[PDB]
Write a protein that binds this DNA or RNA. Structure first.
Lengths: 182, 182
DNA sequence: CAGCTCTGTACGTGAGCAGTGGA
DNA sequence: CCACTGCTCAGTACAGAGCTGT
């Protein structure tokens, strides 16, 4: 099982379906170096240098970023999880975000949100795009922001430098949200 | 983590390097694909239906085949098993084969045998070929038959069918030795 | 320098997969 | 909404750098 990385006062929280064999194994979030998470982060000026999964523990204090997932059971892939298993999941995730209250809940890939929505919000988001969504985290001021899966096991973009747009945008959205309190 | 499947009176005993993330995760030998292992067996004629990692414990009593690995820690794989480890692995592995004494000890993939031999027999082998090897298992009538990895991490045997050859040999070598044996 | 060894890296394929847009 | 696109991830041979003796 893979450790959450959560503190108070976060800008961002990256949010997987649940940890995979590799990540269970290394004990850190997003080991590849195939997978694009860590490059995206560097690419987008979200991190000033280029880091890797070994540095995950530093992300809250130094970049105000943290990690977690709907499910905590570790499997090979989402296709191994029950519907049931996801319910108790986002139930427990809502409860976390109500506790930690970051500015923005960022979802890895349409897939995971698409669930959360027709679960937490009782609504099949039809025709979904990436980035800021209309609903806040229930009982919070936390935004949901949907991000193309960091997994290169994907159609596009996959390729770390085309998901950078969404990182830049996220980054700016963060930036916007700190000016509000001027 | 991954349990040996071993009896007495086995013809063949596949010996993998160690148990990777899938296999670890599912307590069963050669899950993949890509492992061409369950494939080859069938299309090599060594089984008469194509089966998989969950018939693994039936391979003794039904086809007199058994399983085990040189080293036993779970890793990704593979290029990350220590220098040491492997040596000590081989001390245990020998003991088992003197315990159980299968007609043959198939090594799945070079570098294990490559290394086993380097350890057990005192020989760094020139230009290893796949197939039967000079030496018996010390103090047993058990043969050593090298075989190219069934991992698909391996470019120079692109497809499963680039490997069945050794399985058809393997059959034969067993088939010869089986009588003898009137 | 062949031969010896000591790392380093560059390699095919399919299966699984996220996403998009095709029946 | 099955299919279709790019791209991950699951040991081993040769390159070359750096010693030995013709």
């Amino acid at each position: 099982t893979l450790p959450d990385i959560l503190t108070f006062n976060l800008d961002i929280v990256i949010i997987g379906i649940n940890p995979g064999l590799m990540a269970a194994y290394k004990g850190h979030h997003y080991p590849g170096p195939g997978n694009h998470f860590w490059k995206c982060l560097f690419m987008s000026g979200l991190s000033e240098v280029q880091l890797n999964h070994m540095d995950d523990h530093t992300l809250p204090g130094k970049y105000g970023i943290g990690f977690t997932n709907m499910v905590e059971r570790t499997t090979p892939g989402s296709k191994d999880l029950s519907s049931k298993e996801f319910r108790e999941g986002g139930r427990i995730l809502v409860q976390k975000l109500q506790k930690y209250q970051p500015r923005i809940a960022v979802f890895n890939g349409k897939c995971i949100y698409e669930i959360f929505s027709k679960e937490v919000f009782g609504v099949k988001v039809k025709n979904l795009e990436f980035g800021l969504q209309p609903h806040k985290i229930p009982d919070t001021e936390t935004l949901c922001y949907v991000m193309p899966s960091s997994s290169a096991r994907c159609a596009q973009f996959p390729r770390a430098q085309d998901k950078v747009h969404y990182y830049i945008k996220l980054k700016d959205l963060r930036d916007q949200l700190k000016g509000i309190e001027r």
